[PDB]
Amino acid sequence: AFRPTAPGHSPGVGH
């Protein structure tokens, strides 16, 4: 999973 890659609902968990 690409967390810091356009941090959305799953990647950044809203962060």
Residues 4 and 13: beta-carbon distance below 8 Å: no
Residues 5 and 13: beta-carbon distance below 8 Å: no
Return the half-sphere exposure (C-beta side, CA atoms, 13 A cut-off) of residue 12. Answer: 7
Residues 14 and 4: beta-carbon distance below 8 Å: no
d(CA 12, CA 6): 8
How does DSSP classify residue 13? S
From which experimental method does this structure derive? Answer: NMR
d(CA 4, CA 14): 11
Residues 8 and 1: beta-carbon distance below 8 Å: no
* The residue to which tokens 């950044």 are assigned: 12
d(CA 14, CA 10): 7
Q: Which two tokens stand for residue 14?
A: 């809203």
